[PDB]
Design a protein around this ligand. Sequence first.
Ligand code: NCD
Ligand code: NCD
Ligand code: ZN
Ligand code: ZN
Ligand code: ZN
Ligand code: ZN
Ligand code: ZN
Ligand code: ZN
Ligand code: ZN
Ligand code: ZN
Lengths: 362, 362
Amino acid sequence: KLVRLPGLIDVHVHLREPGGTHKEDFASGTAAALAGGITMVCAMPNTRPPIIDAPALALAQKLAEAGARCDFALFLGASSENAGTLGTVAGSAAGLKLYLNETFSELRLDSVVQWMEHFETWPSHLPIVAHAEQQTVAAVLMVAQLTQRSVHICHVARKEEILLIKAAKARGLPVTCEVAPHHLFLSHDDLERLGPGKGEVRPELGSRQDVEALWENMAVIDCFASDHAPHTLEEKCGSRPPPGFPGLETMLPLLLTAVSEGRLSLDDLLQRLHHNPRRIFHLPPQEDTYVEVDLEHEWTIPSHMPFSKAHWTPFEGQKVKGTVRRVVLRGEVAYIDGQVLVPPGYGQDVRKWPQGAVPQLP
Amino acid sequence: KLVRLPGLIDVHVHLREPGGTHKEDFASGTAAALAGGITMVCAMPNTRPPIIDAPALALAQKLAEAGARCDFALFLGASSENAGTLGTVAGSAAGLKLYLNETFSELRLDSVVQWMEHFETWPSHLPIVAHAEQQTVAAVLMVAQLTQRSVHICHVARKEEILLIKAAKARGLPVTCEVAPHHLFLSHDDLERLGPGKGEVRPELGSRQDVEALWENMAVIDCFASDHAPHTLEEKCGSRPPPGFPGLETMLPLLLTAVSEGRLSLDDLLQRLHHNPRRIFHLPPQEDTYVEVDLEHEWTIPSHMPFSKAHWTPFEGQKVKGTVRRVVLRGEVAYIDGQVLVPPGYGQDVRKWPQGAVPQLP
Ligand SMILES: NC(=O)N[C@@H](CC(=O)O)C(=O)O
Ligand SMILES: NC(=O)N[C@@H](CC(=O)O)C(=O)O
Ligand SMILES: [Zn+2]
Ligand SMILES: [Zn+2]
Ligand SMILES: [Zn+2]
Ligand SMILES: [Zn+2]
Ligand SMILES: [Zn+2]
Ligand SMILES: [Zn+2]
Ligand SMILES: [Zn+2]
Ligand SMILES: [Zn+2]
């Protein structure tokens, strides 16, 4: 007996095209998404060139329209030079992305004044998301209050961060957040197995107490999102390993295992991979779209999943219970038992759909 | 013709006793204060032992009462273990001091949750001051708002920081700040002369644009305070130089030079070295206390000032116009033309004066 789920949404993926296509491209990354039960992705702007201006966005839009197998929206990235310049294209993007700490990113800002300028100039009705770790979460929340608008915090990984967000929500502040599967299912304890290169990720893997705090505070977590961040094994195992884990193909199996163990409910999962992503990012429904999963099948995660060009996974060896059997996207079979059945270019930019425009006052 | 000023107050000094008395002690540091026209100092808690518990405060109180030549109040320091334990002694301190970044300090906190705990437990009517640089200013402001109280930001040094504080004040938030003379009168341009050891200070010396921004935004600066941070030349010139500059003996001459040049008024100076320190820290008046200065006398700062045990100064070679001629403290001549005339132990803990207790609701 299969369970039918709606089309799941991953609001934080790195698809590497343009400019990093040996790591992933739209075609391979969206195949990975479909195999993970994900029918819509929001792609981050830290590509080469980075998506920080209208010409770069135009290029990325066409590459995505030609290569994507599932539907998508593309983030713009904040830079030290582009505040006040994105108004004409802002509504065509998933949202604006701010990189506020050291990570794999033309995009670190050098002053909180630059954060303020973005919060003041980006249209008030459109999403802003931040890579903001530890005290940076409190700092960006302050900027959001000074400019009287909301913010969404990416990949929350620490007890400190989730408790700060919890306190902010208790004061009625407009903040939402997401958590990635590696911060729920891996910890410092796994660094011995992973090694120092493979284990590199931002935010870094947390302590057992960090992981426990995220689970205990599930009510504070609005979304799950993979932060799918593919790099090849050669890069991860080399002399200056880039941070990041691939995750599209493993996220849903890990979370379904947790559902089966009673750690959260199926509804809790669907709020975090469907309803809350829709409402925070104003993403449209996908007609005749659904995912069928098998909750009984036990398997062990292999050394690499079939689709991502990363060709490795930090979850190797973990036992999971839960499998994606079939995905239907807009009336076409997109995935069955390991076979992707829609071509590159089947996917569409949801921000171009009438129902995908973000409503605003005249 | 001498100008009579009220007794000036320095709310940020490091007097090194207990435990660092080769760098400074209460007797030498308060001699330096008097020679700088300062009749009351607030001493920071990053001593050895640090002033983070009742027994350490009791020790420091007696050492100060025995050694100080001018009046004083002593800060308590926040630690990772003392939130909720300081209630009985809090009112006897200048305030609570939080070290939120790397500097010469049992006192860095490891989580914003620890900041919140201090803001929640320290009595609401008593001062909290923070060493908070760059984005940390925004972060601690967020904590202050979440806990609905004020905060004072120590040694503001950057355009970024003063503009953030300016924005917060424009939104009516209860934040005050101070600026140290080295951040008004030295910059990156001086590092060639100072060298990498002597030049070490936290916050670091800023760019010419940082210095210009502080002057342009003088209206945002509530207090001047030296951050007198004495270390010996051997330490500053050695293999792991500690950060900090001595400053009590040079602060007023530097600022009087600026007054003479029309960069700020005498009133602007007295607001920042007398009235605002009094009102932010609830410090009492000192009866029959005043300072006589000579605004005409030009001199060049020597390689060391007479009193501080630091026995060096980063302002060596600067030309100043303005000299402290005489200081009277509580009816006794305390300083004349280079001679301190009150003994160690003349100074008193102002928090023990009836008028020095901070008013609170029953
Ligand atoms: N998280 C990572 O470790 N890496 C991400 C960047 C990011 O989400 O910050 C990447 O693009 O490789
Ligand atoms: N500012 C410094 O560079 N040093 C101060 C510490 C401080 O005020 O942070 C010290 O105590 O030496
Ligand atoms: Zn990130
Ligand atoms: Zn995100
Ligand atoms: Zn990311
Ligand atoms: Zn909407
Ligand atoms: Zn400091
Ligand atoms: Zn201070
Ligand atoms: Zn200090
Ligand atoms: Zn008062």
